[PDB]
């Protein structure tokens, strides 16, 4: 099971960016997918979640309206469309998979993480 | 070593226990 993240880099405030997480090693199309971000030196902050089929999408408080999560079950790739970027959005963003370890499936849990990608919202050159 | 509890010639009384 592998989650390859990409799409990071330097973005000026107010522009947009798309993050990608390529899924392999498991049946992607049956699992929910999460985005989790970590501001530099800060704690974890849940970002967005998408249902297996992409019909259901929920977002955290700080990103409603600006962030759009999407899904491609054919390429087994997860995308996070971020818009109206601002200074506070600078964070190392993780894609993550639902997962449940045993039979306590009434736990629906959290599991294996991608390596994480850094997004810097800055006007610096 | 103790358990639950319950509370609640002219004549002949007959009891079958």
């Amino acid at each position: 099971v592998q989650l390859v993240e990409s799409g990071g880099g330097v973005v000026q405030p107010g522009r947009s960016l798309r993050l990608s997480c390529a899924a392999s090693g498991f049946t992607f199309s049956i699992y929910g997918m999460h985005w989790v971000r970590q501001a530099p030196g800060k704690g974890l902050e849940w970002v967005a979640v998408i249902s297996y089929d992409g019909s259901n999408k929920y977002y955290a408080d700080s990103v409603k309206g600006r962030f759009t999560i999407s899904r491609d079950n054919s390429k087994n790739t997860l995308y996070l469309q971020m818009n109206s970027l601002r200074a506070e959005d600078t964070a190392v963003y993780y894609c993550a998979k639902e997962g449940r370890p045993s039979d306590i499936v009434v736990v629906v849990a959290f599991d294996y993480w991608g390596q994480g990608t850094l997004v810097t919202v800055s006007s610096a050159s | 070593n103790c358990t639950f509890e319950y509370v609640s010639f002219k004549n002949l009384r007959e009891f079958v226990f």
């Binding site: 849940w46 993780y94 370890p101 959290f110 | -």
Partner: protein, 107 residues
């Protein structure tokens, strides 16, 4: 939103000690914490799910317990590699949230 607060925010201890980290929820979620171990510069690793089940490959010294609102993560005997930041995380309802983090350092 369901708020999860960890205490203490940090603690110093030595190898072999017994440590206790508590996460308390604003509302009863009744079995839905998940405990992770995070090291600086790398993604977190899941430790305990349903607040009491040990995830495969994690040493048996890690233990979680509780239900409802009061929960505990316990490591029976510390080793050098266990000094790290630990987050609780609820899954009862959306939006999913995390605790603020508990850092374990060397005394």
């Amino acid at each position: 939103d369901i708020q999860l607060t960890q205490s203490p925010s940090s603690l110093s201890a030595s190898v072999g000690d017994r440590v206790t980290i508590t996460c308390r929820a604003s509302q009863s979620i009744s079995s839905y914490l998940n405990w992770y171990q995070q090291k600086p510069g790398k993604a977190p690793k899941l430790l305990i799910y349903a607040a009491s089940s040990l995830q495969s490959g994690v040493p048996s010294r890690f233990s979680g317990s509780g239900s409802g609102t009061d929960f505990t993560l316990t490591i029976s005997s510390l080793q050098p590699e266990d000094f790290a930041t630990y987050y609780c995380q609820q899954s009862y309802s959306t939006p999913r949230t995390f605790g603020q983090g508990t850092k374990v350092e060397i005394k």
